[PDB]
Design a protein around this ligand. Sequence first.
Ligand SMILES: Nc1nc2c(ncn2[C@@H]2O[C@H](COP(=O)(O)OP(=O)(O)NP(=O)(O)O)[C@@H](O)[C@H]2O)c(=O)[nH]1
Ligand SMILES: Nc1nc2c(ncn2[C@@H]2O[C@H](COP(=O)(O)OP(=O)(O)NP(=O)(O)O)[C@@H](O)[C@H]2O)c(=O)[nH]1
Ligand SMILES: *CCC(=O)N1CCC[C@H]1c1ccc(OC)cc1
Ligand SMILES: *CCC(=O)N1CCC[C@H]1c1ccc(OC)cc1
Ligand SMILES: [Mg+2]
Ligand SMILES: [Mg+2]
Lengths: 204, 212
Amino acid sequence: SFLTEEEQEAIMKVLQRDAALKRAEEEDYDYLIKFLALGDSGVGKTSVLYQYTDGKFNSKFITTVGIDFREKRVVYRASRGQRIHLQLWDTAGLERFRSLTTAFFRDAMGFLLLFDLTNEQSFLNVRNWISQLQMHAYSENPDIVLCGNKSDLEDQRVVKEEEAIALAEKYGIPYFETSAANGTNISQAIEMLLDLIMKRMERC
Amino acid sequence: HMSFLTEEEQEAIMKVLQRDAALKRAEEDYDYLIKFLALGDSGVGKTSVLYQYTDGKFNSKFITTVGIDFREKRVVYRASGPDGATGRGQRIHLQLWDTAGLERFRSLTTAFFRDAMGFLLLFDLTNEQSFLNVRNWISQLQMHAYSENPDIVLCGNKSDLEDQRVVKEEEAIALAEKYGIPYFETSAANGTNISQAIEMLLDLIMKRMERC
Ligand SMILES: Nc1nc2c(ncn2[C@@H]2O[C@H](COP(=O)(O)OP(=O)(O)NP(=O)(O)O)[C@@H](O)[C@H]2O)c(=O)[nH]1
Ligand SMILES: Nc1nc2c(ncn2[C@@H]2O[C@H](COP(=O)(O)OP(=O)(O)NP(=O)(O)O)[C@@H](O)[C@H]2O)c(=O)[nH]1
Ligand SMILES: *CCC(=O)N1CCC[C@H]1c1ccc(OC)cc1
Ligand SMILES: *CCC(=O)N1CCC[C@H]1c1ccc(OC)cc1
Ligand SMILES: [Mg+2]
Ligand SMILES: [Mg+2]
């Protein structure tokens, strides 16, 4: 396989869309907040963001061409309501896109790190992903929310919940078991990441 | 049939990104981190121009850039105000991004247009097609930069190869006048106008930064 021009054109459209958005915020809403989802190919990053923004799910696998993003206007409340414009970056997991996607780790204010509860290797790769984030994000200690996705496939689960909770506590990061197919914990995990980011932004 | 990045190519790019992240964390000594980006067709001399500027050296051998790289330079900038009244020396850390011109790297390099505060747009005085593509590069910058009117300095490079020049001076000055951007004929081999073009771009960006 070769880099096609359709693949390259699609990526250029995303970057054009990103430039337009970033120029409009230069300048309605009160804050542009940027997240990035990452993890092995096929763990469900694109599905998770789609379920969150649109409440929909497609079982067919359409691997992401390098990079994409979705948007959602939401209201955040610390524990008054602030209007938040979320840019939700969606990275491709395949190694062939690794250097293009790493280039966008530095644009994110926090990270949604996914593995697949039905694929043990994706869970073992979590610590490497965290290493790459520590090496490439805006800070060596960025906010991360870990998601074990595909919780609706209980008869195919291989990652024991205890093993996942243990890993997440060792690193100090919140953990959620999610399903992009039925929406379980999706908004809870993302709202947790947003709160972690709003608090760290307030104390700046 | 554009080839995908090999694993050697990808490792080289990842090292650059690692180096950039280290640099970006250090800023949280100097007074300002300023970022430029050089772009243009493959083989016009972007890498050579930046190497001549930071190190004063030149290599005849063509080593095409593996996607993206950058060089660094600490310089002292002094504003120019009324009647040549020059201000205090400000310490500037320049990050000079160097993009590959080959199409197979276009989407990787375009991703970095948004990180630059200004652009060094090069063509090759001995290659008319490199000059004819300048208008497309500028359209690509207007579409992808932080502003639809970012600061650009146009460099016609390889001015030392006078017997191979094919770009007439008139057409390039006319193009730069039409777009409102400074134009320099440069040579990375002997240094002519290299520092003038980069200092002009730096001055443009410091002025635009002042008025914020
Ligand atoms: N049952 C179930 N299937 C899911 C879930 N999340 C994703 N999938 C399925 O798993 C496959 C991969 O999903 P996708 O979101 O494209 O994964 P990705 O992480 O974006 N892959 P890539 O990095 O290659 O773009 C798809 O067939 C999708 O339907 C989930 O929670 N439950
Ligand atoms: N005589 C002369 N040769 C030059 C000059 N600038 C570059 N060259 C030569 O032209 C070739 C290409 O230069 P290089 O800086 O690698 O070009 P580039 O724009 O970075 N190419 P790429 O986009 O593929 O990385 C090299 O052989 C280099 O020595 C110049 O001002 N004069
Ligand atoms: C207050 C400055 C800061 O570092 N923040 C705000 C919330 C998280 C963090 C941040 C991370 C990454 C970016 O990249 C745009 C901006 C802000
Ligand atoms: C005055 C504010 C501004 O837009 N500036 C300062 C100098 C150039 C310009 C700028 C462009 C792009 C970036 O991206 C990092 C920063 C600053
Ligand atoms: Mg995807
Ligand atoms: Mg080069």
